[PDB]
Design a protein around this motif. Structure first.
Motif, PDB file in Angstrom:
ATOM      1  N   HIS B   2       0.652  -0.888  -0.240  1.00  0.00           N
ATOM      2  CA  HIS B   2       0.175  -0.107   0.081  1.00  0.00           C
ATOM      3  C   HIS B   2       0.579   1.141  -0.509  1.00  0.00           C
ATOM      4  O   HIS B   2       0.981   1.864   0.355  1.00  0.00           O
ATOM      5  N   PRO B   3       1.403   1.857  -1.003  1.00  0.00           N
ATOM      6  CA  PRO B   3       2.879   2.691  -1.444  1.00  0.00           C
ATOM      7  C   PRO B   3       1.793   3.536  -1.302  1.00  0.00           C
ATOM      8  O   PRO B   3       2.956   5.066  -0.028  1.00  0.00           O
ATOM      9  N   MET B   4       0.863   3.829  -2.018  1.00  0.00           N
ATOM     10  CA  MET B   4       0.176   5.445  -1.740  1.00  0.00           C
ATOM     11  C   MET B   4      -0.090   5.689  -0.303  1.00  0.00           C
ATOM     12  O   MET B   4      -0.358   6.978  -0.166  1.00  0.00           O
ATOM     13  N   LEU B   5      -1.592   4.840   0.220  1.00  0.00           N
ATOM     14  CA  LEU B   5      -1.568   4.601   0.667  1.00  0.00           C
ATOM     15  C   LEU B   5      -0.970   5.465   2.812  1.00  0.00           C
ATOM     16  O   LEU B   5      -0.941   6.244   3.511  1.00  0.00           O
ATOM     17  N   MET B   6       0.074   4.990   2.351  1.00  0.00           N
ATOM     18  CA  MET B   6       1.499   4.875   3.873  1.00  0.00           C
ATOM     19  C   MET B   6       1.503   6.035   3.172  1.00  0.00           C
ATOM     20  O   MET B   6       2.320   6.937   4.205  1.00  0.00           O
ATOM     21  N   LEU B   8       0.280   9.167   1.382  1.00  0.00           N
ATOM     22  CA  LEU B   8      -0.483  10.104   2.108  1.00  0.00           C
ATOM     23  C   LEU B   8      -0.562   9.624   3.947  1.00  0.00           C
ATOM     24  O   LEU B   8      -0.847  10.280   4.813  1.00  0.00           O
ATOM     25  N   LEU B   9      -0.036   8.454   4.487  1.00  0.00           N
ATOM     26  CA  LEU B   9       0.009   8.211   5.960  1.00  0.00           C
ATOM     27  C   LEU B   9       0.692   9.191   6.854  1.00  0.00           C
ATOM     28  O   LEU B   9       0.778   8.980   8.196  1.00  0.00           O
ATOM     29  N   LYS B  10       1.957   9.664   5.797  1.00  0.00           N
ATOM     30  CA  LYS B  10       3.334  10.138   6.461  1.00  0.00           C
ATOM     31  C   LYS B  10       3.334  11.318   7.099  1.00  0.00           C
ATOM     32  O   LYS B  10       3.213  12.202   6.574  1.00  0.00           O
TER      33      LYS B  10
END
Ligand SMILES: [O]C(=O)[C][C]OC1=[C][C]=C(C2345B678B9%10%11B6%12%13B96%14B%109%15B%1172B932B437B%1285B%1363C%14%1527C2=[C][C]=C(C([O])(C(F)(F)F)C(F)(F)F)[C]=[C]2)[C]=[C]1
Lengths: 238, 10
Positions: B2-6, B8-10
């Motif tokens: 889930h790179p895009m989710l990750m 955006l969670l940064k």
């Protein structure tokens, strides 16, 4: 009875919502254009993709959410995303003509538009009923933002590892909501309001399940999946 | 996964 801690929580969530919900809908100009075949799928997929980013921004500001592991943050957002989007969309929904009015005729979506994105009445009918029933609650914005936060941090979501911590975070939000209604929502609108709000969370679970079915059917066809966005495919599945 | 989710969670 509303403790200093609980007012602080409400203030944070009110701020988090204000920072992540644009009531001018200015960014809608960047989406692929609506066309009125699943002619509305590109535009509404862009809209949902845009909404996922806003939901993530809001979730990051929920007190306690950041204390979860990255895995638990991901599973909560993946599972809750479509529910919070439907919840957030109530701000644009109008009972005048049962549509989501986002600032202009182009960005006004009715049941026909949702059907032209690939979805059927099995979802759209309970969706409209949900939007109407939520509107009839006439929630305070305080109650609206608390409901969104409680939606996200549900310990019974599939894939949650640290359900005890998720429940702890949610319990602090639920107690805040219950106390807010008791101290700040006057009767008769307060009548069983917390129970009615939790019933709306149950409604969202069922809407989530039906959206998953239609999304899986829709995205199973590569011609449709081509029209989705990378973020939507990551969050909802390939 | 889930790179895009990750990100955006940064
Ligand atoms: O600022 C802000 O955040 C406010 C953002 O305003 C908003 C956000 C979202 C909505 C909507 B409302 B309910 B109706 B359905 B649901 B909400 B979302 B759109 B409109 B349509 C919606 C919707 C579309 C597409 C699919 C998909 O299933 C499809 F495209 F059909 F494949 C997708 F994959 F999920 F996209 C699922 C659900 C209206 C106003």
């Amino acid at each position: 009875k509303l403790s200093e801690e609980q007012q602080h929580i409400i203030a944070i969530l009110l701020d988090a919502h204000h920072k992540t919900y644009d009531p001018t809908y200015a960014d809608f100009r960047d989406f692929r254009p609506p066309v009125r075949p699943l002619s509305m799928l590109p535009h509404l997929a862009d809209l949902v993709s845009y909404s996922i980013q806003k939901v993530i921004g809001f979730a990051k500001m929920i007190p306690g959410f950041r204390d979860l592991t990255s895995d638990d943050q991901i599973v909560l957002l993946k599972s809750s995303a479509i529910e919070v989007i439907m919840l957030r969309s109530n701000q644009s929904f109008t009972m005048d003509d049962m549509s989501w009015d986002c600032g202009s005729q182009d960005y006004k979506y009715d049941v026909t538009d949702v059907s032209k994105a690939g979805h059927t009445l099995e979802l759209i009918e309970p969706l409209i009923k949900f939007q109407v029933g939520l509107k009839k609650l006439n929630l305070h914005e305080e109650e609206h933002v608390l409901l969104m936060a409680i939606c996200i941090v549900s310990p019974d979501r599939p894939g949650v590892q640290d359900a005890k911590l998720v429940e702890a975070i949610q319990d602090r939000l639920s107690n805040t909501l219950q106390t807010y209604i008791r101290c700040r929502h006057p009767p008769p609108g307060s009548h069983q309001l917390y129970a009615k709000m939790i019933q709306k969370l149950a409604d969202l679970r069922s809407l989530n399940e039906e959206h998953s079915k239609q999304y899986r059917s829709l995205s199973f066809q590569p011609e449709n999946s081509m029209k989705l966005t990378p973020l939507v495919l990551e969050v909802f599945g390939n | 996964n889930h790179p895009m989710l990750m990100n955006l969670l940064k």
